[PDB]
Design a binder for this molecule. Sequence first.
Ligand SMILES: COc1cc(CCNC(=O)c2nc(-c3ccccc3C)[nH]c(=O)c2O)ccc1O
Ligand SMILES: COc1cc(CCNC(=O)c2nc(-c3ccccc3C)[nH]c(=O)c2O)ccc1O
Ligand SMILES: COc1cc(CCNC(=O)c2nc(-c3ccccc3C)[nH]c(=O)c2O)ccc1O
Ligand SMILES: COc1cc(CCNC(=O)c2nc(-c3ccccc3C)[nH]c(=O)c2O)ccc1O
Ligand SMILES: COc1cc(CCNC(=O)c2nc(-c3ccccc3C)[nH]c(=O)c2O)ccc1O
Ligand SMILES: COc1cc(CCNC(=O)c2nc(-c3ccccc3C)[nH]c(=O)c2O)ccc1O
Ligand SMILES: COc1cc(CCNC(=O)c2nc(-c3ccccc3C)[nH]c(=O)c2O)ccc1O
Ligand SMILES: [Mn+2]
Ligand SMILES: [Mn+2]
Ligand SMILES: [Mn+2]
Ligand SMILES: [Mn+2]
Ligand SMILES: [Mn+2]
Ligand SMILES: [Mn+2]
Ligand SMILES: [Mn+2]
Ligand SMILES: [Mn+2]
Ligand SMILES: [Mn+2]
Ligand SMILES: [Mn+2]
Ligand SMILES: [Mn+2]
Ligand SMILES: [Mn+2]
Ligand SMILES: [Mn+2]
Ligand SMILES: [Mn+2]
Ligand SMILES: [Mn+2]
Ligand SMILES: [Mn+2]
Lengths: 180, 180, 180, 180, 180, 180, 180, 180
Amino acid sequence: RGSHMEDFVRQCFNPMIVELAEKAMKEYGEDPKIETNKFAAICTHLEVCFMYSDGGSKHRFEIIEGRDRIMAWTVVNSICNTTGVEKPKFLPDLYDYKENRFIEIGVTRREVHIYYLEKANKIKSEKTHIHIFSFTGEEMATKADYTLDEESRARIKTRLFTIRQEMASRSLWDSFRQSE
Amino acid sequence: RGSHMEDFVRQCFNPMIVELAEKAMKEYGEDPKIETNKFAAICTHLEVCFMYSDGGSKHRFEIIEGRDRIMAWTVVNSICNTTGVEKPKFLPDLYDYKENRFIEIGVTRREVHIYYLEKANKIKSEKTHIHIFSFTGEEMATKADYTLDEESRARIKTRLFTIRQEMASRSLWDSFRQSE
Amino acid sequence: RGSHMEDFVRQCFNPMIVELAEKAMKEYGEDPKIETNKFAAICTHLEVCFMYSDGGSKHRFEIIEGRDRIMAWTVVNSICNTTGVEKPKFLPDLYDYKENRFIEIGVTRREVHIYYLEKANKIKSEKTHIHIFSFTGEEMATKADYTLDEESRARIKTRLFTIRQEMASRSLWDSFRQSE
Amino acid sequence: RGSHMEDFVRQCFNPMIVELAEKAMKEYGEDPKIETNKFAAICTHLEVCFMYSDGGSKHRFEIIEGRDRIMAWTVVNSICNTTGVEKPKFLPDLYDYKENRFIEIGVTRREVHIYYLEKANKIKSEKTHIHIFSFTGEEMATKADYTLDEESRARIKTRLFTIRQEMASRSLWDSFRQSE
Amino acid sequence: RGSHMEDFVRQCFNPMIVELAEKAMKEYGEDPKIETNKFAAICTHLEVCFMYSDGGSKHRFEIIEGRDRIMAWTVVNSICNTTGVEKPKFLPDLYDYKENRFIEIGVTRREVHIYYLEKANKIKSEKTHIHIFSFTGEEMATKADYTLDEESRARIKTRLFTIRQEMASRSLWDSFRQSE
Amino acid sequence: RGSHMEDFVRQCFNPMIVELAEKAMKEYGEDPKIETNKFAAICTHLEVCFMYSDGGSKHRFEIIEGRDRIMAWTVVNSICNTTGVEKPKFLPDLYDYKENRFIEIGVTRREVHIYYLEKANKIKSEKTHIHIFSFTGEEMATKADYTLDEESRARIKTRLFTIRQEMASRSLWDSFRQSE
Amino acid sequence: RGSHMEDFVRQCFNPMIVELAEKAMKEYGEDPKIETNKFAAICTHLEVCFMYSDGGSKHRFEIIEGRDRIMAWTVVNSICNTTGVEKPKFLPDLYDYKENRFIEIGVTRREVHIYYLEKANKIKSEKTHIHIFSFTGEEMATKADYTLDEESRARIKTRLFTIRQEMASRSLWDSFRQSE
Amino acid sequence: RGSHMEDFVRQCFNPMIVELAEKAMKEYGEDPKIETNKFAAICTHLEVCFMYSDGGSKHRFEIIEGRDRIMAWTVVNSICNTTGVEKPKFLPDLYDYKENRFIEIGVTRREVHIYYLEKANKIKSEKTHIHIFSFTGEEMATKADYTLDEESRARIKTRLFTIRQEMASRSLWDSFRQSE
Ligand SMILES: COc1cc(CCNC(=O)c2nc(-c3ccccc3C)[nH]c(=O)c2O)ccc1O
Ligand SMILES: COc1cc(CCNC(=O)c2nc(-c3ccccc3C)[nH]c(=O)c2O)ccc1O
Ligand SMILES: COc1cc(CCNC(=O)c2nc(-c3ccccc3C)[nH]c(=O)c2O)ccc1O
Ligand SMILES: COc1cc(CCNC(=O)c2nc(-c3ccccc3C)[nH]c(=O)c2O)ccc1O
Ligand SMILES: COc1cc(CCNC(=O)c2nc(-c3ccccc3C)[nH]c(=O)c2O)ccc1O
Ligand SMILES: COc1cc(CCNC(=O)c2nc(-c3ccccc3C)[nH]c(=O)c2O)ccc1O
Ligand SMILES: COc1cc(CCNC(=O)c2nc(-c3ccccc3C)[nH]c(=O)c2O)ccc1O
Ligand SMILES: [Mn+2]
Ligand SMILES: [Mn+2]
Ligand SMILES: [Mn+2]
Ligand SMILES: [Mn+2]
Ligand SMILES: [Mn+2]
Ligand SMILES: [Mn+2]
Ligand SMILES: [Mn+2]
Ligand SMILES: [Mn+2]
Ligand SMILES: [Mn+2]
Ligand SMILES: [Mn+2]
Ligand SMILES: [Mn+2]
Ligand SMILES: [Mn+2]
Ligand SMILES: [Mn+2]
Ligand SMILES: [Mn+2]
Ligand SMILES: [Mn+2]
Ligand SMILES: [Mn+2]
């Protein structure tokens, strides 16, 4: 195939992140060698999810994203059958042991307002918290509750804009934006 | 022997946990290859004990469980001869340097109410704190003092229900429950 | 799913071997959680291939098995376009830099005579060397040329019979044999 | 070349620090083998920058110094395009996610009063925070805001005076002072 | 020589601790193979010093003990020439960046009251803080200021009584006590 | 218990060797804390077995000693069912893939002539090769076939005499000799 | 800059190789970010040099390439002043302790005949051995003496053709060939 | 002290070598901080001894140099009491299990002829093999038997001349030569 995007994704993200995004796509019948613009998105979404859980206390979050589909639903059941939160219809990204809610992390190339509206329409669970990030530096969260401290969220926005700059420096950003 | 339980225990728990539970059973004349349902219990009890001490401050707990019988009693003596707490009749699991008391950790497959009553009858030391966990997500502690924060205890309950789900997914949970 | 085979495969083989066999099946639309008898075969075939290359000199073999389908064909092309050997129709397992030939490694649960005959009918390349191993301790190679020393091949047969014993000790061998 | 300074710098500083200072000089057309007094300064400035970021919270600082010139400006842009701080004219050393400002770290062999005055004249950005350290144990910061706790800044002053003592013990301090 | 004490010291303490105590004795013309009772004391004193600095914040303490005689005095000078504290007459064990004072750590086999009185008579520096521990579980500190939290000091007392029990279990404690 | 032997064994042998000898004794109902003279023998026998297999080629030997009783018999069966050698009545120490025979390694504190005669009377398998070492530097092997090169066997004799010297230097050798 | 070549070079070669080629170019006033086609050549030449020394015995070769210019000439002097070989006019790549000669390794994108002729004209040292490799699988060496075994040289040719295939798969080979 | 030699020795030799030479001098009442020219010699002698044993087979040599005085004599006794070689009067450097003799390694700054004559006069053991190296590239061995292959000895001579060049590049060689 030989995509400049694919080689950039392998140089941009940590090797363990690339491996999980590969397993995530293959589990859903997708090839990172051809769906390279996607490939960059699951890597980006995975890193943001891991930096998100890195914020806060040690035992605060339970990481759902990055596990296999069967195991992620197993941990979701264990969380629901121990706390009492209703089972979400779709797989969330994290669970906040401090606020007692599931968190859906979103990373958008378009306006934060549109994605969240698209995400909120999907999740009929209602109780699931939504937190959206953009590649321009904006963010949007449910009830204006941004969960983490400002410094942890600012670190995520900075990294997102760095991925955007490195992509545009290789003339790959325009195709990345016009693909979501 | 070739027990599905034994292979599940080795896949479910961290290798160091399995090694300590093996040494614990062998020290008391028990073979994990035949007493597989037990084998899963010492592993579960060991992990809960280690996640428990992982909660709280750095120097808060002294881990008694997981040591050899002679060395565990040596540390118990050192704690008693330095603080002044009475020597317990039976080996506890942890010592809380913050609350100045020994902690007995229990993990039950039956109702939390029965196990604690069974545990409290045994410990005539009285001063020893009891903290029970169940595979269904409930917990019971002495004087309603649960020692740790809610997030640390919720992480233990979630892991316990995951072990239950993985066991039932292999048709091994029913024999595990009807063996305590 | 919860298969005793799946847990045995994870306990029997080295973790890196299990990961490569997982990626190998998923690349060809197969799930190790349901195709557990297969899952044990790619792991077994992978280990035999790696012990095979472990025999002989340092730079003797080029390992084709265990790579992704695209990369394995890239190395096959490089070997053909540098030595002059004809491109095989199917992906082989190794290349012998000493004998200047590709090697197809086979591991059979049935009689070695049948598998090799089945393998030789497939490879019209003719030049590709075939080396078959069985779980009973027999082996068969092209032109009676067994490539490696007797000690290296004996180590492979011993390991194969150990996998057979561990499988039969868990009542999983009968289903493994009646599935090839 | 064979400079006593060069061998002292390699023995005094951590190997990773020496490698970054080497790459920093070579990127700007300087050879650490001849510009040995300089070589000791970029190493010293690099370590102080890393101990500075080591103070405070986990996600507090973004380390600009120690990166390549192109990548450091990329992170500066990402910070400016996400928070809104004006782009500084010169490359700073850190960014404080807590106070929302860039920090310029200075290490002087002369009086702290002169260096800061020289530094403040250069940075027309105004918003950039300046923090100066000396090899005698004094420090000077903008608006008397020293950012970190006293213990973290005291650790930096102690290390600086140790470098001075080790240098003077080798008769290399006098040439180091008369070279800034 | 073949001393039971020497083999116990190597089994009781961490290997890095044993190496530093060896270098400490040899620097002062002492052989751990014959002065085995001493050998156990520098190891004990070294571990207590390291557990002491392990208490408190990250940048709180500067470890003087465990360095070579020349380097320890270099760091003492740097601390004195940066904070302003008077140079102590004898080498202390730690410096408290929080309380701005040097700390002398003592471990006694006799009554805590006698050792501290012996230590206080030696240090004419006056400003140096003294903190004594005993193998029986008692402690004594200057101005009743024990610097660390109760849990960190209780961990040190517990370890000291464990060393006493292991020594007495080998009939080596009586000679250890009658040698200070 | 507090045995000088036990502390010497932990200081003399590599930690992994001590762990295997511990598991070996406990599997056969023996406590290394009281049976200390024995404890030194399984450690010595284990190291000699590992240095023995270290001699020769890479795939030459299959290590039977050091495995659990069930797994060692599994590998013995695999070797017998693949080569054709008769199943030995007692567990041997190694299998020689080069000479096609099992090897029984013996380490004696008495005369090599007596032990081998005692060993040969036990093994009715006849085909099993016997190789005896002594703590004085002598050795005896079946059919005068010493399997390995002279340098590898000389390294084993040297190590054995070093263990003897270290034991006698602690007045533990006399009890060690009068206990076989 | 954002070159597809630069990202491919970082994905194709081992990270340590990329670091040495970076230091090699910067030492000679070249930037791998703009001279990307070159950047791929020093990486390729470096790997071939390291695989070359990997062939043969343990102490056979002394690696000159990959060191700094000053240190490489130091080792060249030591080799000349100990064996007696004349000092070469230009820095070679290796020294063969077996054949007692320096080796110049060449990797060409054009015909092997032209490069060697260009190389031989440069080296007036005459005694220096020349060994050329091409990306098509051919090789040329002085006096038809190819130094290493066929398997080691075949491994180098295979890797070279793999780099060519990966480059052409990204449409970067044509610019790579038309740049030597 | 601050010696350019001391800093060069720490930069020139591997850290483990420097630590052993430090322990070797301190065991004999010598300080590497003042006896810096010596300090460079024990490091040089230690490395040559380790490269010497690195030549030849795996179990060929027993390394005597680099151990403590008591332990080195213990291994010497074990070698003498197992092979039968007479106990040497002075501590040798290695034992050759292949040739059955002790080896004394010498490194001279003067003529090889003088040192060996000085060494041979000392060793009345006669059976001990002597092998001398010089910093100019010459060597001298007993009975013209140089033990190792030419390539292994040539690697030692090359390293010795590199140490000489690095020393002379720092104006430290002249004092090093005029101190033996
Ligand atoms: C759809 O196929 C895949 C499925 C998974 C696992 C489940 N998906 C998520 O969890 C998830 N996916 C996305 C996402 C990413 C790229 C394109 C489209 C979307 C919608 N954005 C999230 O925020 C999120 O949480 C992983 C990779 C895939 O390619
Ligand atoms: C009984 O034999 C063993 C003894 C030990 C060490 C001492 N036991 C405990 O500390 C302990 N045991 C249990 C426990 C676990 C399984 C079945 C029955 C019980 C009662 N539950 C605890 O809560 C606890 O603290 C370890 C493993 C054994 O199999
Ligand atoms: C078929 O789907 C898969 C394909 C691959 C990669 C290509 N296959 C081989 O290379 C290969 N496969 C087998 C094999 C293994 C199990 C069942 C059936 C067979 C026929 N036996 C070989 O000897 C061999 O060389 C890996 C795992 C798969 O499940
Ligand atoms: C000038 O050439 C180099 C440039 C860099 C990168 C950019 N420079 C800094 O960031 C920087 N330099 C200095 C500095 C250090 C030594 C002498 C003179 C000065 C002025 N003091 C800082 O405080 C600082 O922030 C690194 C090493 C160089 O040699
Ligand atoms: C005296 O010779 C040695 C000197 C040092 C370094 C300086 N000494 C201390 O720092 C120090 N020594 C002791 C100490 C320990 C054992 C016996 C007697 C005493 C008095 N108790 C401390 O509290 C302390 O701080 C180390 C080991 C020695 O053997
Ligand atoms: C007997 O109980 C134990 C059993 C094992 C495993 C099986 N035993 C051997 O394999 C084995 N034992 C011995 C041996 C060692 C000490 C005392 C007596 C003897 C006779 N000498 C061998 O040469 C040998 O091969 C390990 C440790 C034990 O304590
Ligand atoms: C003399 O004091 C020390 C003793 C030792 C251990 C025993 N010495 C040797 O083994 C040894 N010494 C030397 C040597 C080295 C420097 C100056 C003088 C000499 C004569 N040359 C050898 O060849 C050798 O074998 C180590 C370091 C010392 O400083
Ligand atoms: Mn998700
Ligand atoms: Mn999401
Ligand atoms: Mn317990
Ligand atoms: Mn319990
Ligand atoms: Mn295949
Ligand atoms: Mn195959
Ligand atoms: Mn800067
Ligand atoms: Mn600065
Ligand atoms: Mn002290
Ligand atoms: Mn003290
Ligand atoms: Mn045995
Ligand atoms: Mn035996
Ligand atoms: Mn070159
Ligand atoms: Mn070249
Ligand atoms: Mn010597
Ligand atoms: Mn010598």
